[PDB]
Design a protein around this ligand. Structure first.
Ligand SMILES: CCCC[C@](C)(O)C/C=C/[C@H]1[C@H](O)CC(=O)[C@@H]1CCCCCCC(=O)O
Ligand SMILES: CCCCCCCC/C=C\CCCCCCCC(=O)OC[C@H](O)CO
Ligand SMILES: CCCCCCCC/C=C\CCCCCCCC(=O)O
Ligand SMILES: CCCCCCCC/C=C\CCCCCCCC(=O)O
Ligand SMILES: CCCCCCCC/C=C\CCCCCCCC(=O)O
Length: 444
């Protein structure tokens, strides 16, 4: 095929891939080193690492492909020894699997953040995410080093412009392993992305999710530190030690026979009741009432959060902080709240609350604005792009293992070219398209 064999493909592919990935890295560096409030620096860390992984993979492969075209093909002439072909095979496989596993790591992380928000906020440290991206790399590099040892081999592919995984036992096992490793990556990505979208639709009110991150959600009847029956977001059922008395208390509050188990919607209903009662306490308190009225809906949630943690009297003791809230001295009020025994006992919770009072945003807890639909469309796009670009290669390889005269050589070049396109689209899908086309979103 005179059409498929052209130097115009690697030239335009390298050009588009280079610009996108070098710029994605530049924007990530400007957005991460800021030192603000949110610990979502790990999401920037993954995108930044993905851009680097994609850029290096293109810089190491494409110049060789260009050189063989200029020399008038015959890879075996330019490389009589097996060094460049095995190296090319290695660099194609290590950077190919790394892109798919980083895409999967992000999918898993987003899913954990939304499906288990309480556990995510306390268990992370950021050092774990940096170690995972290092570990994934070494595990992939070790697998890619198998033909060097003896398991499988890297051969010259049609039209003699590139090298890849060859398709008795060693060659077939190494090829099958790559095929199943690639399909596992796509299945893990699709599953976590579908789970995330489903959960974004299920999301409750902004107050509900705020206290879920701070206190946690339990849908089964459990005992607290004092031994009292509790459910949902810290809702005490009864002070009686009887389990029967607790199940009948929950059944009265809900309506139906729950038998210790409830739904997120029912937990939100019990939470909304607790919100009504805490507002009653605030309005009845002489000191908390003028503060509550002067504050906006977002800042009121930060006050309700404090009342849930310390109680009506506990919050009232912060006389100096409350006076600054009505006077709208947000920066000064933050300092006085930080100078407390509460801040030292629960540093992560106090930091998220103080930021909500200071900025008047949900930023410390998450997005939840118009970004909730923006993320849904972005996750949907990932699944579409990843499947069209990476499925033909993976299916072609499984077909080759299962065993002009054949037109498989022509389609295999189309298949690897599509898989290479995924690492050109990556900076656009994950960062650049949102950062550039952020204005037409408000227009539409
Ligand atoms: C198998 C998946 C590898 C994907 C990768 C890790 O991202 C590396 C691909 C790099 C491409 C780049 O995107 C432009 C280029 O040239 C590289 C090799 C393309 C395959 C060989 C085709 C040879 C030809 O054009 O005749
Ligand atoms: C010859 C081949 C020509 C290249 C084909 C298509 C490039 C366009 C691909 C657009 C990728 C979809 C991105 C999208 O629309 O989703 C929104 C975005 O992810 C929100 O952040
Ligand atoms: C606005 C988003 C930017 C997207 C840029 C698109 C980059 C496309 C670059 C090169 C085309 C790659 C060719 C892959 C198709 C394989 C078919 C073939 O070999 O004929
Ligand atoms: C020739 C190359 C063929 C082009 C292949 C893939 C382009 C990807 C199209 C992405 C459309 C996104 C659809 C969506 O999620 O709404
Ligand atoms: C999952 C979706 C996979 C869909 C299609 C796999 C690509 C089909 C490969 C057969 C092409 C061989 C040929 O040229 O006849």
């Amino acid at each position: 095929d005179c059409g498929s064999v052209s130097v115009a493909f690697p030239i335009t592919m390298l050009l588009t891939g280079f610009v996108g990935n070098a710029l994605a890295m530049l924007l990530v560096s400007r957005s991460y080193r800021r030192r603000e409030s949110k610990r979502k620096k790990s999401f920037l860390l993954c995108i930044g690492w993905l851009a680097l992984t994609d850029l290096v993979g293109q810089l190491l492969t494409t110049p060789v492909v260009i050189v063989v075209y200029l020399s008038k093909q015959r890879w075996e002439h330019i490389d009589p020894s097996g060094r460049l072909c095995t190296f090319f095979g290695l660099t194609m496989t290590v950077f190919g699997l790394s892109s798919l596993f980083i895409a999967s790591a992000m999918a898993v992380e987003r899913a954990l953040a939304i499906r288990a928000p309480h556990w995510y906020a306390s268990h992370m440290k950021t050092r774990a995410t940096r170690a995972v991206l290092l570990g994934v790399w070494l595990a992939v590099l070790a697998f890619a080093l198998l033909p060097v040892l003896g398991v499988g081999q890297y051969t010259v592919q049609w039209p003699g412009t590139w090298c890849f995984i060859s398709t008795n036992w060693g060659n077939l096992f190494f090829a099958s392993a790559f095929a199943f490793l690639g399909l596992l990556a796509l299945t893990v990505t699709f599953s976590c992305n579908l789970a995330t979208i489903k959960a974004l639709v299920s999301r409750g009110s902004n107050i509900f999710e705020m206290l879920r991150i701070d206190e946690g959600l339990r849908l089964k009847i459990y005992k607290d530190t004092e031994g009292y029956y509790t459910i949902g977001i810290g809702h005490l059922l009864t002070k009686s030690p009887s389990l029967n008395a607790a199940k009948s208390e929950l059944d009265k509050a809900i309506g139906r026979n729950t038998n210790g188990v409830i739904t997120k919607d029912e937990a939100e209903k019990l939470f909304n009741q607790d919100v009504d009662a805490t507002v009653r306490g605030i309005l009845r308190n002489a000191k908390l009432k003028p503060v509550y009225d002067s504050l906006d809906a977002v800042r009121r949630a930060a006050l309700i959060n404090m009342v849930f943690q310390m109680g009506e009297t506990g919050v009232a003791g912060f006389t100096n902080s409350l006076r600054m809230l009505q006077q709208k001295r947000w920066d000064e009020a933050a300092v006085n709240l930080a100078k407390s025994r509460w801040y030292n006992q629960t540093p992560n919770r106090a930091k998220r609350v103080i930021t909500t009072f200071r900025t008047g945003t949900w930023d410390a807890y998450g997005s939840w604005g118009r970004i909730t639909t923006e993320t849904a469309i972005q996750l949907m796009a990932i699944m579409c792009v990843l499947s069209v670009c990476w499925s033909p290669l993976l299916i072609m390889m499984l077909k080759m293992i299962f065993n002009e005269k054949q037109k498989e050589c022509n389609f295999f070049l189309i298949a690897v070219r599509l898989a290479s396109l995924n690492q050109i689209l990556d900076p656009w899908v994950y960062l650049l398209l949102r950062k550039i086309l952020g204005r037409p979103l408000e227009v539409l």
